[PDB]
Paper text:
At the molecular level, CAMSAPs/Patronins stabilise uncapped MT minus ends and support MT minus-end growth. Previously, we showed that CAMSAP/Patronin CKK domains preferentially bind to a zone behind the extreme MT minus end, which corresponds to a region where the lattice undergoes a transition to gently curved tubulin sheets. Using this, we determined reconstructions of MT-bound CKK domains on both 13- and 14-protofilament pseudo-helical MTs, allowing visualisation of a wider repertoire of tubulin conformations. The reconstructions show that both NgCKK and HsCKK form an intradimer interprotofilament wedge, contacting both α- and β-tubulin subunits in a tubulin dimer pair (with constituent monomers numbered α1, β1, α2 and β2).
We also investigated the CKK domain from Naegleria gruberi (NgCKK), which does not show minus-end binding preference. While the structures of mammalian CKK domains have previously been determined, our NgCKK reconstructions now reveal the near-atomic resolution structure of a non-mammalian CKK domain. It has a typical CKK fold, but sequence differences compared to HsCKK are reflected in structural differences in several loop regions. The NgCKK N-terminus forms an ordered density that is associated with the surface of β2-tubulin, although the density was not sufficiently defined to allow accurate modelling. Furthermore, there is no clear contact between NgCKK and the β1-tubulin CTT. However, NgCKK MT binding is shifted relative to HsCKK, resulting in a modified interaction with tubulin including even smaller contacts with α-tubulin, contrary to our previous prediction. Indeed, the overall NgCKK footprint is smaller on both α1- and α2-tubulin compared to HsCKK. Superposition of a single tubulin dimer from each of the 13- and 14-protofilament atomic models for NgCKK and HsCKK reconstructions shows that the interprotofilament lateral angle in 14- compared to 13-protofilament MTs is ~2˚ shallower. In response, NgCKK is only slightly altered in its binding site on 14-protofilament MTs, but HsCKK experiences a larger displacement out of the interprotofilament cleft on 14-protofilament MTs. Intriguingly—and in contrast to the HsCKK—the intrinsic protofilament skew in both 13- and 14-protofilament MTs was unperturbed by NgCKK binding.
Residue numbers in the entry:
A (entry chain A), D (entry chain C): 1 to 37, 47 to 441
B (entry chain W): 634 to 692, 732 to 737, 739 to 780
C (entry chain H), E (entry chain G): 1 to 44, 47 to 360, 369 to 440
């Protein structure tokens, strides 16, 4: 009676979606065929026969990565009307994923979401998995967040945006494909979770002792975080928190709604020994600078509204005991106007392991979702990567030729520059 | 007295090759009357891509241009030229000294 | 889907095509007959990008062969992998090459052009989603410069929204095999920066030294130089027809590369380039497959990368490797080559990784440079045009076909900007 | 409820700590695995599973000696993040353990100590094992005692310095490295115990009859002395003495805090017969001129504040009897201002023999500590070994080239010369 | 970690190294191919100091082989352990040796200097913690004195904060195999006190008397002289690549040793040196492996240690022994020889003990002295300069390449202080 659905726009959302839907079948005994040997109705509109198809719409412009799904192990799971493909990709071009080619199949996408809201009576929210890199994942979501607010408007719309790193970038027009996706979705997003590609490599290197992490392994860490946010629907816990409740505790203004996730503990199999990982210990591992999955220095700002999503055998006294240590500490300075900014959710499931993953089986976990202040310097970075590449008019001739104007680039920067004034608007102290 | 640790990094990491040959031959004769001053540091555009921007001395005075004088607070990191691998090596220091030779500014 | 047409023109192009469709057809496991014998089923999942299924389970290449004499077309037909082609494609003339740009574009190019395009149209109606037109010519000769720079201006008249990518062989600095190649080049550069998208400018002079130093051969035949070019040629499109962990195609390798609509002249590269006996000394790891790439000895275009700077840099890999080893090494070399990149382009390493290595190796790297290092390629050619135009030597053949004296200054006026802009966009800062 | 961590800076500190942590696992039945078939909470932050990891931080710059630990018998024992290595050693150079390499990994060390004291509610003291020889053992300690006096300040900070021998020295800049590390640690050390190599070679020859003593065998004697100081926490006796109770009895003036250890009886296995070793016999063996573990003549001075730490089956009547025999003797002269200067502790544990060691199993032991007078004549030794190498200015060109001023060498000598005056300030008779 | 580069220059240097890498290969158990066959796993724990692992579990040396003619490099490549090296390292020239400091530094040293250092730069990028640079040359010739004294003045331009330890065979008093070796050494002494850190002055003269009296041979070939030198050359570094009790390394063998930044000329030593049959008469104990050392017959540098005194005397012991027996003997020989040490250096013995003896022994001693005994090495050489400069004979060859008559007086003025400083700090008391 509470059903959330998921959309997989681009490729970086689709291969993360291969890590999510593999993982849900382990937490419920679901086969890849949909067979199983009662609260899993939040993701699976079932059939009168034995099969549990998922609630997922895989839209893609190029037919490349979808054919790995149509031929892989989870071929039999999905309904083959969900698996929507096309002919030519946007190819890192906002004007080929929002104006030219993305205009074509948009009436096959929304009409497919139309036939999934009728299998639901308690429709809950949206899960668009995408990235800010390409012009498909950040050029078609910007089209599609406009459309699902025309359809509903009053439903929660959660993204999981894979963030462009300050160290490593595998594109060239990537600071053009991020300023354009802000302006289009900022008036119709709900709460976009930032996850960085860079910071997972350090967590795979130091805390896990993996020197060769593949894209198979950077998505296992984003699999458990998405499994932790939606852990309160599929299971009964001590203090549950539904998806409609995230938009009020975490979003202080109609602009600042960019939380960065953080999972803990992350340990190797050999280091499951040698330590005990108490809730008073693993909570201090949340607020380290060395464990944040978006590369900033969190001791260079504040914290407007944190949020802790515990799970496993966790004592709610020791939660209060571990938190009362934290607000007494020195380095972790919250915001003056926020009195005390936590929203703690204790659930009754251990963090389940996937076979083949290099994560130890621990008895408890936490997915901190910290709306910090200091990430605006990382928003200040992707304007300095805009200004130097726009005074020389570099790479503009691909956008102009496919339906995009010159007037809409210094426009959205000033809109982004208005979003950068708002974080220093937070950092003031309105005294007396 | 670290003339060798900076001239090696002038023509291998910051201004190397045939492109800026006219540029780095300027900054040899500029410091010829200098280097009796003990230490000299450079400014670096970014810790990821080290490009040369300004040449300093340690007395912080610019001779070939950013700011004419620096403070300790606007310094991002303190980098050490790894001679064995022609790269940068970060430090835990916040003050100056014999160890530091490469500084990066903030914004 | 995403079908590509492969047109061949000139003698130099038509002997890569005997080797290219041997480079390709050994990856997909294609016999000299035209059938399939490979083991993996990943090959036939994307066989239709270059092929057509015929009756009996046979696959034939989508290639269209153009010449002005039946000389070299008889060699490719009589050669191995020659009977794989569709025999209607072989469109050839009678008057010979002429080694003459004024003949292959104004005299013989004006007769056989419509008998080419109707076979092109027959090959394009059999394709659902047309991608682009990879064309194999060379700037040196007269067949592949008069006819090869005509199909640019005729097929883009028919297909104005596809990708046009030529695979050209550029004249060398030291040795010259044509006396009028300072006239065949400048008449073609005028036609390339009109209606193309990219051009993999490959030299011969740097291609010999790699066969001497790095490959360590003794007698390099053209069967071992085109063996090295066509190895690089398949690596560009191998992410368009095989599953990769980070996908690229012939538009992602078009938008990410080209910063301005004229500066689109590339320079390839490849790794590993072992020796026959020195394949037991170097470790085959991603930090070793990159340090071989960013040295100047590996650049097949005969210029120095340390002269001039880079604008955008691609690095298409193959094989099965890990994305941290890639992303560490793409950071690591940009530290130690920081002065060789340009300032107003940050994060200037485009990177893609496929998952199918070449048949027999373990991993391989295809480099796609784009630099201001090729400013003294055009400075070299447009000077050889200058001294040969003062005394107006060799002019009584092009003028004899009816070509005007101003048009040679017109094409020289076009290259006058293009030399300046690699200087103009070098020291322009912000 | 009481915890005392142990840090092993250097190499000579660590190789003793290879023999120390061998002994505690004998005194508690612990395997090298951390398995075992409320007395051991002082050295084992135990896990809820079966493993008792020690509270140890092994830090050294050169990665040679630590790889013996990571491959030895006690591989599985330690928490592997504790074992901290580096690349280039200090190599007997003070300006490479405090200015060049010591600044590199000081933040991996202190943050690792930071994650140990949070597992401690009753934190008691420090045990920094370091020798005065190298520029790691006396250049990284002097950096580290500055830093841990910033974090804690009030806590007790015990060290164990392997003294430079008066006739035998296996280094050339060793009379430099003692004056350097004194000046830095004298304002922040607590009670620095001097143990000499040369006297342990004497005891291995005469009282043990071993003609080939290896560093396997010169560390078993220091392993018993370190164990008997920390024997009152781990056990329970008729009169116990905690580690904070050392620094008040033993340090009269805040400069003179350099006592020398002495263990007794040290007998061979064949000499366990032929004698009786009574509680009034072994205490006369404590105050011999021969049986002291620093090669000095104790009859060339006085005794400011002795200490006796017995263990085993000891009756407190005869302790009062054997002490009363001692102050009536001729040669032993206490200082005139100290009325009676003893501080006696009795435990209920015999000293445990280690297999392979050539020490005989006895019923009782004594770990004599004595803040004596005449050790400053051996401090006068390490300035005549300084003045002859500072006048001709030898070896200075390695210090100056690695971040070290010239003015900090006659400065620290005068501070060492001020330490020489205070012992002669003690020995006077302030009459009337 | 702590990798070491092993550059080889000159004919004398390139024939020790062919024997030197035969020594290192037998302590770690290395075949001629490159694989592993040893029994102990302690050998591979620090294998990465001289080696780079290649594919298939094969180790190759980190050696860079510099030459001016292809003569001697043909002998090493055709000889055994020739195929262990990497075939890109063999950097050689064409114009012969020359036996000429004006040719190995001004004529052929000007061209082949960057073909060396680019291979040096390729070896250093494959190293994590770069330790130092051991160079195998000889003061006598003209390849190992012009080219070998150029690389120090180019690598310290590139690596100013490392250690540069050269292994120089020094000319003998009686026999002289070069007439102008009094010109070769005094031009090389000018280039080692500038930019080195230590220099093992090994002679030929005293090396035969060890091979005649102590070893009791009849016909000493160079295959047995360099057999004896390389046994010392591997002993200095075995406290870095094997676990020891009281450790030492190349920087601990720098700060302990060198009192002043110019007096860094060391003299080697080794024990035991048995006869073939007289190994059954002498006891193999540490008090016998010390009295063999501190006598003058064991010194490989041909000078009398009793003339002049010592400054810092280190003695790296090896094998399984006990530290009391060590420190008893290092005290005993300082009591009985106290007049041969200097007054103002107290406690003047550095001592190291490792645990892996050579294959077949039980314990071994490597002695690294330092003395004022080599005032009459420089009193010998600088006078042979002097009588060959009053008439200024042999000058019309070095001047012929462009060298000035003051530059010979500059290098002679450099040695004029260095003779005085072993006299200035000899009787300086306090
Ligand atoms: C059956 C047996 O034990 O034979 C011994 C042996 O009899 C004696 C006589 C050897 C032998 O040495 C000689 O005959 C000799 C000849 C010319 C020059 C120098 C030595 C031996 O050849 C040498 C050899 O030494 C080694 O193997 C060391 O590892 C040595 N290796 C080499 O020198 C070497 C020789 C050939 C090829 C490659 C390496 C070494 C020493 C220091 C550092 C590294 C390596 C040894 C113990 C033996 C023999 C075989 C007879 C002695 O020498 C050494 C260096 O060990 C000479 O006095 C010692 C005492 C040894 O007992
Ligand atoms: N988390 C995650 N990110 C990935 C993976 N593969 C690629 N990426 C990221 O994807 C980003 C590029 O955007 P993509 O989504 O792959 O591209 P696209 O949306 O399909 O658009 P085009 O490729 O231009 O058609 C880069 O920043 C990569 O870091 C993966 O397996 N997991
Ligand atoms: N008691 C004892 N002393 C030792 C032992 N090993 C070495 N030493 C002493 O250590 C002193 C040398 O200092 P070290 O601590 O070993 O050197 P270091 O501080 O590690 O620094 P490096 O010089 O870089 O190795 C000498 O006086 C030795 O007697 C040992 O096992 N036991
Ligand atoms: N790489 C390569 N270059 C070739 C080959 N054949 C000819 N060329 C080059 O092509 C140029 C001559 O042009 P060519 O194509 O034969 O003349 P055309 O037939 O009139 O186009 C010269 O620079 C030749 O070096 C070949 O097989 N491989
Ligand atoms: N110990 C030793 N000395 C050698 C050897 N070969 C040559 N020498 C000495 O090297 C000197 C001649 O120098 P050489 O290196 O051959 O000349 P270069 O090639 O110009 O450097 C003479 O003193 C020779 O005795 C050898 O194998 N061993
Ligand atoms: Mg895509
Ligand atoms: Mg040490």
């Amino acid at each position: 009676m509470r059903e959330c659905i998921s959309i997989h726009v681009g490729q970086a959302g689709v291969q993360i979606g291969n890590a999510c839907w593999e993982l849900y079948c382990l937490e419920h005994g679901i086969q890849p065929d949909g067979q199983m040997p009662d609260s899993f109705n939040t993701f699976f509109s079932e059939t009168g026969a034995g099969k549990h198809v998922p609630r997922a719409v895989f839209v893609d412009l190029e037919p490349t990565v979808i054919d790995e799904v149509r031929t892989g192990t989870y071929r039999q799971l999905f309904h083959p009307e969900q698996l929507i493909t096309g002919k030519e990709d946007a190819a890192n071009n906002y004007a080929r994923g929002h104006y030219t080619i993305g205009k074509e199949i948009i009436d096959l996408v929304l009409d497919r979401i139309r036939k999934l809201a009728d299998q639901c009576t308690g429709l809950q929210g949206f899960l668009v998995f995408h990235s800010f890199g390409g012009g498909t994942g950040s050029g078609f979501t910007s089209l599609l967040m406009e459309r699902l607010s025309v359809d509903y408007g009053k439903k929660s719309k959660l993204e999981f945006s894979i963030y462009p790193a300050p160290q490593v970038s595998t594109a060239v027009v990537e600071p053009y494909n991020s300023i354009l996706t802000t302006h289009t979705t900022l008036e119709h997003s709900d709460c976009a979770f930032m996850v960085d590609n860079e910071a997972i490599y350090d967590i795979c290197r130091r805390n896990l002792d993996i020197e060769r992490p593949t894209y198979t392994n950077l998505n296992r860490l984003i699999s458990q975080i998405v499994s932790s946010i939606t852990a309160s629907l599929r299971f009964d816990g001590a203090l549950n928190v539904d998806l409609t409740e995230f938009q009020t505790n975490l979003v202080p203004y109609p602009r600042i709604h960019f939380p960065l996730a953080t999972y803990a503990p992350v340990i190797s199999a050999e280091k499951a020994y040698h330590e005990q990982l108490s809730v008073a210990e693993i909570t201090n591992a949340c607020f380290e600078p060395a464990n944040q999955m978006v590369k900033c220095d969190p001791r260079h700002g504040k914290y407007m509204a944190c949020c802790l999503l515990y799970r496993g055998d966790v004592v709610p006294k020791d939660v209060n005991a571990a938190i009362a240590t934290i607000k007494t500490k020195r380095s972790i300075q919250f915001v003056d106007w926020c009195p005390t900014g936590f929203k703690v959710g204790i659930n009754y499931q251990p963090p389940t392991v996937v076979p083949g993953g290099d994560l130890a089986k621990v008895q408890r976990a936490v997915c901190m979702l910290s709306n910090t202040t200091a990430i605006a310097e990382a928003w200040a970075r992707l304007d300095h990567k805009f200004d130097l590449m726009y005074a020389k008019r570099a790479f503009v001739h691909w956008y102009v030729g496919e339906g995009m104007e010159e007037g809409e680039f210094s426009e959205a920067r000033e809109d982004m520059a208005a979003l950068e004034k708002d974080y220093e608007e937070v950092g003031v102290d309105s005294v007396e | 007295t670290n003339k060798l640790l900076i001239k090696n990094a002038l023509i291998h990491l910051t201004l190397a090759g045939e492109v800026n040959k006219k540029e780095r031959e300027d900054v040899f004769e500029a410091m010829k009357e200098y280097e009796d001053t003990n230490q000299m540091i450079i400014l670096v555009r970014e810790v990821n891509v080290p490009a040369f921007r300004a040449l300093y001395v340690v007395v912080v005075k610019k001779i070939i241009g950013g700011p004419k004088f620096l403070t300790e607070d606007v310094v991002d990191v303190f980098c050490r030229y790894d001679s064995g691998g022609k790269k940068l090596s970060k430090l835990s220091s916040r003050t100056f000294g014999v160890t530091t030779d490469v500084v990066v500014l903030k914004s | 889907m995403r079908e590509i047409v492969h047109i061949q023109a000139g003698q130099c192009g038509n002997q890569i095509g005997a080797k290219f469709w041997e480079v390709i057809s050994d990856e997909h496991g294609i016999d000299p007959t035209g059938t399939y014998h490979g083991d993996s089923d990943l090959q036939l999942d994307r066989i239709s990008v270059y092929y057509n299924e015929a009756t009996g389970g046979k696959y034939v290449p989508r290639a269209i062969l153009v010449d002005l004499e039946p000389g070299t077309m008889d060699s490719v037909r009589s050669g191995p992998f020659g009977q794989i082609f569709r025999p209607d494609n072989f469109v050839f003339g009678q008057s010979g090459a002429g080694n003459n740009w004024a003949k292959g574009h104004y005299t013989e190019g004006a007769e056989l052009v419509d008998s080419v395009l109707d076979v092109v149209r027959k090959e394009a109606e059999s394709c659902d989603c047309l991608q682009g037109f990879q064309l194999t010519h060379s700037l040196g000769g007269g067949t592949g410069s008069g006819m090869g720079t005509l199909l640019i201006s005729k097929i883009r008249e028919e297909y104005p929204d596809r990708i046009m990518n030529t695979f050209s062989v550029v004249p060398s600095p030291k040795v010259s095999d044509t006396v009028v190649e300072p006239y065949n080049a400048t008449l073609s550069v005028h036609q390339l920066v009109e209606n193309t998208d990219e051009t993999y400018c490959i030299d011969n002079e740097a291609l010999y030294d790699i066969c001497f130093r790095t490959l360590k051969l003794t007698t390099p035949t053209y069967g071992d130089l085109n063996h090295l070019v066509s190895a690089t040629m398949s690596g560009v499109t191998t992410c368009l027809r095989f599953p990769g962990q980070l996908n690229a195609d012939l538009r992602k390798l078009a938008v990410n590369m080209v910063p301005f609509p004229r500066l689109h002249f590339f320079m390839p590269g490849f790794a590993p380039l072992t020796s026959r006996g020195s394949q037991q000394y170097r470790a085959l790891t991603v930090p070793e497959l990159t340090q071989q790439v960013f040295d100047a000895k590996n650049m097949m275009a005969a210029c120095d990368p340390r002269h001039g700077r880079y604008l955008t840099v691609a690095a298409v890999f193959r094989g099965r490797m890990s994305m941290k080893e890639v992303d560490e090494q793409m950071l690591n070399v940009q530290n130690k080559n920081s002065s060789y990149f340009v300032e107003w382009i940050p994060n200037n390493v485009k990177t893609a990784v496929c998952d199918i290595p070449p048949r027999g190796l373990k991993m391989a790297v295809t480099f796609i440079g784009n630099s201001t290092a090729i400013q003294e390629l055009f400075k070299r050619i447009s000077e050889q045009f200058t001294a040969m135009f003062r005394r107006k030597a060799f002019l009584h053949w092009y003028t004899g076909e009816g070509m005007d004296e101003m048009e040679f200054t017109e094409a020289e006026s076009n290259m006058n900007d293009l030399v300046s802009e690699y200087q103009q966009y070098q020291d322009a800062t912000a």
